């Protein structure tokens, strides 16, 4: 095989893959925790030396594998490098997107549930004291996802949240089951424009927010005012790189799978650059101009930063709607906010489930319908772990969405640009390109990028190896045990797929 119908649809599909919850939730938090402008320099650099090259690399690998009827890494890694271990490493191209999808889709169902409740107007009703304004919404969120009073391991999701999660899964399925061109592409051409429009509107509305405590203006200033005292802080660089990986959907095997449906002769250079650029625009210009400026507007910079450090969902699901509730038509404004998050998340969720679907179709020769339904079944079932187990979400997001993507990014780059050959890879990347990659990026891909990632991983491992063993909560061990099981499961499927070939 299936292919993208038009170039536009391809672009919007890829853009739909990248632009998501990571733009309007993760980014604002990351940028706020790291000192605003101080975070932007490493962010941009990371975008130039990591995001772009890896994006092109994944597009290339994707199309390359797609030409031979393989959209997933287990097979592609083998095409690029002949080895059993290459397939084993390729398993991550399925494990990562699957694990991430498990909790990602659940968070997506959250945005949907909130969108509905805010649309219908069922929300907490605040009365000049910040806590008296935020508390109702904190209780609102906690009641929705069933957060425990103290630090208790069990979550008690409301019936509504559960039902909404089912609906979300259904929507994802209804889109995925129609295929690449008919299902994903069609929806992209609608969801994306809608997304951009809503984002712009929100940006403007938020912009107009001004109080005795501050202005959205001050927030934007805080975000775009350079600070170089933080450039000696490794944590900032690590956070920047992590954000780049997450937002561009790098290391998730999603880009590759999407790229495998691009015709062998079609350009991946300009298309890839456009998709990445669109994402960054949606991230720094749109995402960073909504939450932070609003928080700063009402509570000021210091408090806004504190709120950001408080949590990832605290700014998006609590603070912002609480701020909106204090303005005329603030309930409807909250709805637009959660409808935006839902479309952004939906366009991404379908992208991280596709790798699994593509593997079942290509390697196990399953029909699209069956592949989708089973993928949905697996995700839905596994989701109960994230739904009822506290801290499970964070564990999955860490192992898969943080460490895994970087490790996998390094792995894929090493396999493609080193083992498979640098020149053959470069030639494969530039082939059919409407425009050609700057020569300098050849030396960036072959030397700079892998070294940077390697160093990053080394640093990470050092701090984490001791902490892992000494962790008190059982919920995390359960999660670890289960996801390890998923890995074995996928490895087994790859084994079967391998045997069927012979």
Ligand X SMILES: CC(C)C[C@H](N)C(=O)O
Binding residues for phosphocholine: 84
* Residue 275 engages ligand X in binding (rule: CB under 6 A): no
DSSP-based three-state secondary structure for 263: coil
Nearer to Na ion, 15 or 493 (CB): 15
Which 8-state DSSP code applies to residue 324? H
Q: For residue 351, what are its two tokens? A: 């992208």
The nearer residue to Na ion, 251 or 300, going by C-beta atoms, is 251
Paired tokens of 141: 């969120």
When binding is defined by CB under 6 A, the residue of 13, 15, 21, 323 that contacts ligand X is 21
For residue 347, the partner it binds in Na ion, ligand X, none, with Cβ less than 5 to 8 A by kind, is Na ion
Which residue ranges make up the annotated binding site? Answer: 84
Return the range that interacts with ligand X (CB under 6 A); candidates 60-68, 187-195, 245-253, 293-301. 245-253
Contacts of 489 (CB under 8 A, 6+ apart): none
What is the distance in angstroms between the CA of the first residue and the CA of the last residue of the chain?
21
The answer to whether residues 308 and 34 touch, using CB atoms and an 8 Å cutoff, is no
Q: Which does 73 bind (CB under 5 to 8 A by kind): ligand X, Na ion, none?
A: none
Which residue's CB comes closest to Na ion?
20
Task: Determine which residue in the list 111, 289, 291, 347 makes contact with Na ion, applying CB under 5 A.
Answer: 347
Question: Interaction with Na ion in 112-171: which residues (CB under 5 A)?
Answer: none
Task: Work out the burial of residue 24: count CB atoms within 10 Å of its CB; fewer than 13 is exposed, 13-18 middle, 19 or more buried.
Answer: buried
Q: How many helices (H) and strands (E) does the chain have?
A: 26, 2
Return the one option of ligand X, Na ion, none that residue 254 interacts with (CB less than 5 to 8 A, by type). Answer: ligand X
In this structure, is the dihedral angle defined by the CA atoms of residues 227, 231, 235 and 237, taken in order, positive or negative?
A: positive
Which single residue is written with the structure tokens 């690998």? 61
Residue 20 in the binding site for Na ion (CB under 5 A): yes
Q: Which of 11, 12, 18, 297 binds Na ion (CB under 5 A)?
A: 18
* Smaller CB separation from ligand X, 268 or 352: 352
CA 330 from centroid of its chain's CA atoms: 28
Query: Quick one: tokens of 476?
Result: 């995390």
Q: What is the 3-state secondary structure (H, E, C) of 188-224?
A: HHHHHHHHHHHHHHHHHHHHCCEECCEEHHHHHHHHH
| Count of residues of this chain found to bind ligand X when the rule CB under 6 A is applied | 14
72, 168, 249, 354: which one binds ligand X (CB under 6 A): 249
Does 399 sit near ligand X (CB under 6 A)? no
The span from the CA of 205 to the CA of 357, in Å, is 40
> Is residue 247 at the binding interface for ligand X, with CB under 6 A as the rule?
yes
Rule CB under 6 A: choose which of 9, 20, 253, 409 binds ligand X. Answer: 20
Q: Is 22 in the site for ligand X (CB under 6 A)?
A: yes
Smallest distance, Å, CB 251 to ligand X? 9
CA-CA distances (angstroms) from residue 130 to 33, 213, 282, 326, 330? Answer: 21, 12, 30, 11, 16
Q: Which run of H or of E encompasses 304?
A: helix 291-310
DSSP three-state, residue 363: coil
- Is residue 32 close enough to count as binding ligand X by CB under 6 A? no
Nearer to Na ion, 157 or 404 (CB): 404
Under the binding rule (CB under 5 A), the answer on residue 22 touching Na ion is: yes
CB of 282 or CB of 476, closer to ligand X: 282
DSSP conformation letters of 441-485: HHHIIIIIHHHHHHHHHHHHHHHHHHHHHS---HHHHHHHHHHHH
Q: Which does 21 bind (CB under 5 to 8 A by kind): ligand X, Na ion, none?
A: ligand X
Interface residue with ligand X, options 52, 161, 254, 290 (CB under 6 A): 254
Q: Which two tokens stand for residue 154?
A: 């069990």
- Return the residues of window 216-235 that contact ligand X according to CB under 6 A: none
Q: Mask 240-259, x = binds Na ion (CB under 5 A)? A: -------x------------
Binding track over 267-306 against Na ion, x by CB under 5 A: ------------x---------------------------
Q: What are the distances in angstroms from CA 463 to CA 101, 147, 391, 458, 459?
A: 27, 29, 20, 9, 7
What residues from 323 to 362 belong to the interface with ligand X (CB under 6 A)? 348, 351-352
Q: How far is the CB of 324 from Na ion (least distance, A)?
A: 23
User: Which of the stretches 80-88, 247-255, 287-295, 448-456 binds ligand X when contact is defined by CB under 6 A?
Assistant: 247-255
Q: Give, as ranges, the residues between 139 and 178 that touch ligand X (CB under 6 A).
A: none
| Nearest residue to ligand X, by Cβ distance, number only | 22
The number of angstroms, rounded, from the C-alpha of 495 to the middle of its chain's C-alpha atoms is 29
Q: Report how far residue 457's alpha carbon sits from residue 445's, in angstroms, rounded to the nearest whole number.
A: 17
Give residues in contact with Na ion (CB under 5 A). 16, 18-20, 22-23, 247, 279, 344, 347-348
Give residues in contact with ligand X (CB under 6 A). 18, 20-23, 100, 246-247, 249, 252, 254, 348, 351-352
């Amino acid at each position: 095989r299936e292919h993208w119908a038009t170039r536009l649809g391809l672009i919007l599909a890829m853009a739909g893959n990248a632009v998501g919850l990571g733009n309007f939730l993760r980014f604002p938090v990351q940028a706020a925790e790291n000192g605003g402008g101080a975070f932007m320099i490493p962010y941009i650099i990371a975008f130039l030396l990591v995001g772009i090259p890896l994006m092109w690399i994944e597009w290339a690998m994707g199309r390359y594998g797609g030409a031979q009827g393989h959209g997933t890494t287990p097979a592609i890694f083998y095409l690029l490098w002949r080895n059993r271990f290459a397939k084993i490493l390729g398993v991550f191209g399925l494990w990562i997107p699957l694990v991430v999808a498990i909790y990602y889709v659940y968070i997506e169902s959250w945005t949907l549930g909130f969108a509905i409740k805010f649309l219908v107007g069922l929300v907490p009703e605040p009365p000049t004291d910040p806590d008296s304004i935020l508390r109702p919404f904190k209780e609102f969120l906690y009641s929705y996802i069933g957060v425990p009073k103290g630090d208790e391991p069990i979550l008690k999701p409301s019936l509504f949240a559960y039902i909404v999660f089912l609906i979300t899964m259904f929507i994802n399925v209804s889109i995925l089951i129609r295929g690449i061109s008919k299902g994903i592409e069609r929806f992209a051409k609608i969801a994306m424009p809608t997304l951009f429009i809503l984002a712009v509107f929100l940006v403007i509305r938020v912009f107009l927010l001004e109080t005795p405590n501050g202005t959205a203006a001050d927030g934007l200033n805080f975000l775009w005012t350079p600070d170089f005292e933080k450039l000696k802080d490794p944590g900032v660089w690590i956070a920047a790189v992590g954000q780049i990986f997450f937002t561009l959907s790098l290391g998730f095997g999603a880009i590759i799978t999407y790229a495998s449906y691009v015709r062998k002769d079609q350009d991946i250079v300009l298309s890839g650059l456009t998709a990445a650029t669109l994402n960054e625009k949606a991230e720094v210009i749109l995402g960073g101009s909504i939450s932070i400026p609003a928080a700063v507007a009402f509570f000021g910079v210091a408090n806004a930063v504190a709120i950001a450090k408080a949590g990832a969902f605290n700014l998006g699901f609590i603070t912002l709607p609480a701020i909106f509730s204090q303005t005329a038509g603030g309930t409807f404004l909250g709805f637009l906010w959660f409808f935006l998050l839902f479309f952004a998340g939906l366009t991404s969720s379908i992208a991280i489930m596709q790798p699994m679907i593509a593997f079942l179709e290509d390697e196990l020769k399953l029909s699209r319908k069956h592949a989708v339904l089973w993928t949905a079944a697996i995700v839905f079932f596994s989701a109960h772990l994230v739904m009822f187990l506290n801290k499970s979400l964070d564990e999955m997001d860490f192992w898969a969405g943080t460490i895994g993507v970087v490790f996998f990014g390094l792995t894929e780059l090493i396999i493609f640009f080193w083992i498979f050959g640098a020149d053959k890879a470069w030639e494969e990347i530039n082939r059919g390109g409407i425009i050609k990659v700057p020569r300098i990026y050849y030396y960036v891909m072959r030397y700079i990028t892998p070294a940077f990632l390697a160093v990053l991983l080394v640093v990470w491992a050092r701090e984490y190896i001791p902490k892992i063993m000494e962790e008190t909560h059982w919920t995390v061990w359960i999660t670890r045990f289960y996801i390890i099981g998923l890995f074995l499961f996928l490895t087994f499927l790859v084994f079967l797929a391998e045997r069927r070939r012979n």
